[PDB]
Design a binder for this molecule. Sequence first.
Ligand SMILES: OC[C@@H]1O[C@@H](OC[C@@H]2O[C@@H](OC[C@@H]3O[C@@H](OC[C@@H]4O[C@@H](OC[C@@H]5O[C@@H](OC[C@@H]6O[C@@H](O)[C@H](O)[C@H]6O)[C@H](O)[C@H]5O)[C@H](O)[C@H]4O)[C@H](O)[C@H]3O)[C@H](O)[C@H]2O)[C@H](O)[C@H]1O
Ligand SMILES: [Ca+2]
Length: 415
Amino acid sequence: KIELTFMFRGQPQEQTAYKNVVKKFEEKHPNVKVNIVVTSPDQYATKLRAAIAGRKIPDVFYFNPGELRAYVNSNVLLDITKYVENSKGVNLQDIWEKGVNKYRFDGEKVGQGNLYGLPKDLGPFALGYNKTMFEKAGIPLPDKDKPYTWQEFIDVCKKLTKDTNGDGKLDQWGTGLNATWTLQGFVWSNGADWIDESKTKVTVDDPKFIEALQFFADMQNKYKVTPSIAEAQTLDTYQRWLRGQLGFFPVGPWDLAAFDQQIKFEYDLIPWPAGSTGKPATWVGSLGIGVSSMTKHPKEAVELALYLSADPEGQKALVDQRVQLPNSVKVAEEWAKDPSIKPANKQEFLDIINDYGHSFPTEYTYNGEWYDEFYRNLQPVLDGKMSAEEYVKKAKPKMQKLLDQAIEQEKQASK
Ligand SMILES: OC[C@@H]1O[C@@H](OC[C@@H]2O[C@@H](OC[C@@H]3O[C@@H](OC[C@@H]4O[C@@H](OC[C@@H]5O[C@@H](OC[C@@H]6O[C@@H](O)[C@H](O)[C@H]6O)[C@H](O)[C@H]5O)[C@H](O)[C@H]4O)[C@H](O)[C@H]3O)[C@H](O)[C@H]2O)[C@H](O)[C@H]1O
Ligand SMILES: [Ca+2]
């Protein structure tokens, strides 16, 4: 009888995981058929915006929490409050509250009110270290609790940076962080942010922001605890991490499957290094699972979303397949305490969610074009061809205009 379109994004391992779980779902609901539309993480936002622009919207789909408000105003998302209430036994309250609450909207704020999506997951971005090269080097292991200072972090990265096969060429580096996904921690840890408290002013020219930005770039260009620009060009640092060439690199729970398959060294999680604030910082990501407000099959569509987001047996298969941590708080707590399941300090993930993880800036803004503009022309700063001070001075009014326009578009689309 019922056919359903499901679009989402994922790295190869994530795609395989969700397809198997949709197949479990179909077995449990033999009158529902799910046609899948899946993309790479990169190509995803463009395709969804084209589907929405043409009002050819999938029954069920992934979406950015920072688009909730705009999606609601434009009538993109079905209000699913009652379909989830009347579901069998499902207890959304067992799910992470910061997760579920990203997809609530009472007409004026995102804190409370009706449900317009379910959280796919929470994605704490932890720091990982290669325990195998640390030991082989004779370097004391990092503290599981007490974060490196920036200076300390650079020191160890230096000791980890060397020519190990004695051919005269460096073949191992302390680290190689990707600014797109790892600059936030340093900014936030240094007491800065992309925007102010009100979330209406751009603050990337705060001296604290500049200092963190400069420190990030300097680890490739000045401290040289990084493969060179050319070397990174030859093989990106993600890949070099997988190959065992890097001391440190981030780890999200969506990595665990890929890492099971490729990483041969022992590795574990630690807090991110801390800037002036003394406190570690990093992000906790999330994607929403929403339902087309114009789906012909709201009941069944909500049923597919619930199965992926909260259903005990649907959650279980996704965690088994190592592409996320459990959405149920209590389950994740016993998951984090289970020693048979690597890495050892899985607990760090939860620590990031409860204590020292933050949201992306765009989650507070009506759209994120202002933020995308910061990263669009950032590469010359990363490659040392201009300072952090002069890029952010040049780029701040560009991104204040975009932010002003986003605030204006939310007045206009919501009245
Ligand atoms: O070093 C310079 C760069 O290297 C070259 O690019 C190489 C890159 O390496 C490969 O990427 C490795 C992955 O990247 C990191 O993961 C970051 C992103 O997370 C994954 O999705 C998980 C998903 O996101 C979470 O939520 C995040 C946000 O929160 C919301 O506000 C918003 O909606 C979300 O965006 C969810 O919790 C979770 O489910 C993506 O797959 C990944 O991009 C990890 O280190 C690895 O997973 C890849 O080949 C290249 O991108 C370039 O030359 C240079 O830029
Ligand atoms: Ca060498």
